């Protein structure tokens, strides 16, 4: 299961899932700890998600942010939603990019992704 634009994302890669949201790992992480949080519903633009699915995606992000900046040794994070194609979007889903940051600071197998997912899954126990 798990939708993400035109393609599905395997549970094996999903490390969090809420009532209205779900979080997963990037196949090509800009930096380590790069993880996304997208609404469960596959709406293409922000203003499309209800006001409920707007709290969940961001309350979740909140966690996913603190559970990833931790496990990757960041000292802060950078969040950024690319809404609309003039914004740079390429997957047609609303979704937040959470990246853990380090002072003056990538492709990988499904299996390696399955581990990153598995590792993180633990901080949400």
**Dihedral sign (CA 106, 99, 67, 42):** negative
27, 45, 71, 121: residue in contact with ligand IB2 (rule CB under 6 A): 27
Shortest spacing between CB 78 and ligand IB2, in angstroms: 4
Please say if 95 is a catalytic residue: yes
Token pair for 105: 């600071």
Contact 100, 33 (CB under 8 A): yes
41, 42, 43, 46: residue in contact with its own copies (rule CB under 8 A): 46
Token pair for 119: 């590792």
**Does 82 carry a binding-site annotation?**
yes
Position 90 contacts ligand IB2 (CB under 6 A): yes
Using the CB atoms, write b or e for 64-86: b if 16+ within 10 Å.
bbebbbebbebeebeeebebeee
Shortest spacing between CB 12 and its own copies, in angstroms: 28
59, 76, 80, 106: residue in contact with ligand IB2 (rule CB under 6 A): 80
Position 35 contacts ligand IB2 (CB under 6 A): no
- Active site residue ranges: 95
- Binding-site annotation, residues: 7, 26, 82, 88-91, 97
């Amino acid at each position: 299961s798990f939708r993400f634009g035109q393609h599905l994302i395997k549970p094996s890669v999903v490390f969090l899932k809420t009532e209205l949201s779900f979080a997963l790992v990037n196949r090509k992480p800009v930096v380590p700890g790069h993880v996304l949080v997208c609404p469960l519903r596959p709406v293409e633009r922000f203003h499309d998600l209800r006001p409920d699915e707007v709290a969940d995606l961001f309350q979740t992000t909140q966690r996913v942010g603190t559970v990833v900046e931790k496990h990757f040794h960041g000292t802060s994070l950078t969040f950024s939603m690319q809404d609309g194609p003039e914004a740079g979007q390429t997957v047609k889903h609303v979704h937040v990019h959470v990246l853990p940051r380090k002072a003056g600071d990538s492709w990988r197998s499904e299996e390696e992704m399955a581990a990153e997912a598995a590792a993180l899954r633990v901080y949400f126990q």
